[PDB]
């Protein structure tokens, strides 16, 4: 059913009462307590009704967190960095000695940053055809992180409307400084330039191994999507803005070829033939020898933002949130089934509340006379809901992290000669 802003608060209260995975959330944040009070020194920033902004809300323990969540009923949940003192008592320490120490490396991808290139929708609209954009972006970034740097643990979260966030949560990464993160983001960024700049790539004859891997893994998706779905070379103004990306020496010839041609496939083939002919006939041209490659990267590569990762005290939306516009709950995305992730099929708050009502209806004749605490009741509650695959994926990631901790402690035991 259509989400209405005039009915959300009661559903939000019910969700915070029943379905919010407090146990797994605490288990992830606590990190096993290897470092004293590591979870106790985290900064939170809620957002209550009437768009009032508050921050610096620590939590002594999991039970206190549950009680405060039940009482407060906030809209957006965010995660900060770990400091040297409890954030709620930040005014009790001399100024300058209260500094951020560690936080998880994150990246953001904004779907709306492709308006000048995309034509499927307008502004804040989405289509199933354009989802391949963030799909291939996810594949590229995940492969680059997994291979080039070797970061072990990764957790992809769909924001809810147009974005997907990266939550790198390894051990040897949380201690990095700002300069190293800036270097990471610079190395992972290729689309460079402001509004005034048209061409987003200036590549020489030499090609980096990273660019080679990207272009190899990008061919299998560029053809179908670009040629058939979006049809970049459809209209006159389309190739009119296309030809601005190439030297003027063949502008008229390519325009005549497009006029002769009928569909975008023929125009793309003629562009490829002309480019190949020019490469064999290179004569004092400052342009790179990869016209086709550079145009595909310009219209196909993802775009990041250095500001969200350069800062160490910055804030970003926590998973399992509730977007106040569509009611879709932010859920993790499976790494091995990315191509089967339809954005429109993610369960919403209204649907999950009706599911809870039907679950109670079933409980009227299936589960009766139970003297259990709220823990087991809520466990079976979110087991019976539609979030079960998502929490299962979250639990599998947590199990992987726990196995990594077991391996690291066994390695420490081997080094320390304690058996």
């Amino acid at each position: 059913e259509t989400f209405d802003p005039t009915e959300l608060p009661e559903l939000l209260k019910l969700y915070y009462r029943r379905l919010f995975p407090y146990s797994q959330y605490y288990r992830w944040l606590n990190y096993g307590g290897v470092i004293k009070n590591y979870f106790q020194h985290r900064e939170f920033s809620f957002t209550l009704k009437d768009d009032i902004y508050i921050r610096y809300q620590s939590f002594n323990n999991q039970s206190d967190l549950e009680k405060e969540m039940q009482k407060m009923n906030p809209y957006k949940i965010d995660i900060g960095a770990v400091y040297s003192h409890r954030p709620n008592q930040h005014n009790t320490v001399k100024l300058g000695a209260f500094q951020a120490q560690e936080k998880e490396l994150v990246f953001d991808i904004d779907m709306t940053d492709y308006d000048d290139v995309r034509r499927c929708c307008s502004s804040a609209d989405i289509c199933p055809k354009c989802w391949t954009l963030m799909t291939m972006a996810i594949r590229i970034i995940d492969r680059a992180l997994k291979e080039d740097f070797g970061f072990k643990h990764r957790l992809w979260v769909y924001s809810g409307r147009r974005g997907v966030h990266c939550w790198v949560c390894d051990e040897s990464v949380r201690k990095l400084s700002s300069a190293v993160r800036s270097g990471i983001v610079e190395y992972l960024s290729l689309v460079k330039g402001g509004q005034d700049v048209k061409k987003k790539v200036h590549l020489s004859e030499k090609i980096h191994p990273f660019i080679r891997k990207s272009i190899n893994i990008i061919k299998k998706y560029f053809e179908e999507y670009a040629l058939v779905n979006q049809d970049i070379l459809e209209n006159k103004e389309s190739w009119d803005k296309i030809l601005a990306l190439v030297p003027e020496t063949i502008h008229d010839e390519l325009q005549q070829s497009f006029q002769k041609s009928h569909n975008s496939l023929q125009r793309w083939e003629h562009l490829k033939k002309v480019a190949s002919r020019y490469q064999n006939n290179i004569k004092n041209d400052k342009y790179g020898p990869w016209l086709e490659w550079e145009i595909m990267l310009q219209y196909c590569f993802p775009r990041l933002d250095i500001n969200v990762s350069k800062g160490i005290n910055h804030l970003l939306k926590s998973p399992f949130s509730v977007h106040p516009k569509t009611g879709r709950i932010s859920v993790p995305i499976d790494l091995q089934k990315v191509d089967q992730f339809d954005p429109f099929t993610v369960p919403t708050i209204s649907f999950i509340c009706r599911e809870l009502d039907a679950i109670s209806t079933n409980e009227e004749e299936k589960e009766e006379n139970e003297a259990e605490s709220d823990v087991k009741h809520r466990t079976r509650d979110y087991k019976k809901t539609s979030l079960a695959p998502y929490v299962k994926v979250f639990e599998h990631f947590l199990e992987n992290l726990d196995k990594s901790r077991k391996g690291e402690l066994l390695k420490k035991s081997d080094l320390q000669k304690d058996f």
Binding site: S84, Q89, T92, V93, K94, A97
Partner: protein, 121 residues
């Protein structure tokens, strides 16, 4: 808001007669300032006995040190696994010339009055 700071003479806290995580305020005389590791070892005499308390200082830098002088420390106590008992400093001021016996008698009298008022309830 934090928890208040109750007084404690050095030898009681030296024997670990307080629960972990409590907030306490005590006194003593500095003996060594480990520069690199941000650790302070102050001492206080008791007849023929000398007691030692370890003080983390990570929250009051920069901080001048006066070797062989009295001090007042207020903070929270954490029972470490190997290091034992260390107090997390929040405020650390220096006082000199103040006689100990007046202070000790003062806390003794205050404790006695609190217990006396506690006899009615």
């Amino acid at each position: 808001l934090p928890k208040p700071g109750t007084y404690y003479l050095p030898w009681e806290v030296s024997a670990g007669q307080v629960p972990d995580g409590s907030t306490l305020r005590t006194f003593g005389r500095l003996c060594l300032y480990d520069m690199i590791q941000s650790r302070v070892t102050l001492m206080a005499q008791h007849g023929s006995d000398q007691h030692q308390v370890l003080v983390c200082t990570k929250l009051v830098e920069p901080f001048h040190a006066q070797v062989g002088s009295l001090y007042i420390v207020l903070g929270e106590l954490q029972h470490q696994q190997d290091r034992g008992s260390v107090v997390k400093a929040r405020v650390l001021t220096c006082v000199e010339g103040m006689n100990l016996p007046l202070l000790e008698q003062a806390i003794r009298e205050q404790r006695l009055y609190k217990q006396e008022r506690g006899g009615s309830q």
